[PDB]
Amino acid sequence: GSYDRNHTYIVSSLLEEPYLSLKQYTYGESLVGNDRFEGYCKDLADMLAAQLGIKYEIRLVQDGNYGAENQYAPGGWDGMVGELIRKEADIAISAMTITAERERVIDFSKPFMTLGISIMIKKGTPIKTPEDLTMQTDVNYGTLLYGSTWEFFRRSQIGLHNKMWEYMNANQHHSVHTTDEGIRRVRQSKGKYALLVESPKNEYVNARPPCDTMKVGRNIDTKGFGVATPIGSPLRKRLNEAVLTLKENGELLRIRNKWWFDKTEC
Numbered sequence: 001g002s003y004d005r006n007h008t009y010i011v012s013s014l015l016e017e018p019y020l021s022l023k024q025y026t027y028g029e030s031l032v033g034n035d036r037f038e039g040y041c042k043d044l045a046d047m048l049a050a051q052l053g054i055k056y057e058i059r060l061v062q063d064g065n066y067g068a069e070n071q072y073a074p075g076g077w078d079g080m081v082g083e084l085i086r087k088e089a090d091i092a093i094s095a096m097t098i099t100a101e102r103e104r105v106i107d108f109s110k111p112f113m114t115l116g117i118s119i120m121i122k123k124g125t126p127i128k129t130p131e132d133l134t135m136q137t138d139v140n141y142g143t144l145l146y147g148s149t150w151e152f153f154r155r156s157q158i159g160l161h162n163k164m165w166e167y168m169n170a171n172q173h174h175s176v177h178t179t180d181e182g183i184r185r186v187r188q189s190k191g192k193y194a195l196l197v198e199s200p201k202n203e204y205v206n207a208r209p210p211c212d213t214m215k216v217g218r219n220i221d222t223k224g225f226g227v228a229t230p231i232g233s234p235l236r237k238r239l240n241e242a243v244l245t246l247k248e249n250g251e252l253l254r255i256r257n258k259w260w261f262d263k264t265e266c
């Protein structure tokens with residue numbers, strides 16, 4: 001009640017199914033504003049905005065990136081993280097992984113979803129574990145360049161993870177600028193490409209046509225997605241409270257089931 005509720009809050013996000021996607025285009029009708037978008041993060045944004053009694057406007061991140069330390073970016077970070085640092089958006093509501101490095105420059109709510117790094121293969125690929133990848137030659141692998149999975153391997157103290165880091169850093173052509181290009185490479189590489197991909201995306205893709213991909217191995221780590229705000233935001237406490245409210249009242253579970261379980265065609 002002690003923050004501006006006439007302001008339309010700018011919500012940075014990033015198209016990445018099923019978190020956020022464009023509603024299917026139809027004949028003779030043009031969607032505008034937030035109506036263009038659907039998905040888990042759209043439903044989350046709607047519910048958070050309702051909890052806070054605020055208006056909001058989704059504005060997609062202007063470089064298509066989640067956020068990485070970048071010696072060229074103003075404020076030191078690109079992507080949604082940089083938009084928050086530079087006060088170009090008020091909130092980011094996306095599949096933004098909570099990392100120690102990002103917490104030093106922006107604030108996160110408690111997590112609204114838990115996840116881990118996982119492996120996606122085309123069915124038939126003779127890979128069952130991360131260790132397997134490092135013991136063979138024919139299957140190349142990679143991840144989203146410079147995101148949280150990339151940084152996990154760069155920074156990990158586990159020898160296996162450092163071995164995977166050294167390979168990927170020396171073979172950046174086998175990593176990708178969008179996770180969807182990684183998934184296309186899995187599908188189109190005849191069993192010779194594996195993708196390191198966060199488990200909710202992996203699980204979503206594997207459960208839908210063409211049913212040609214699968215997850216192998218245990219998740220490599222455990223972490224969360226959070227709602228992100230620029231430091232000092234007047235909304236920080238209320239947004240965290242709202243996430244906790246939606247977690248306790250079953251609403252986060254409802255929209256997770258909506259976008260993952262209700263959409264299982266395989």
Ligand SMILES: N[C@@H](CCC(=O)O)C(=O)O
Pocket residue numbers: 066067095096097098143144147148149150196197198
């Ligand atoms: N969710 C990740 C991007 C995907 C990935 O790095 O695997 C991030 O916030 O950086």
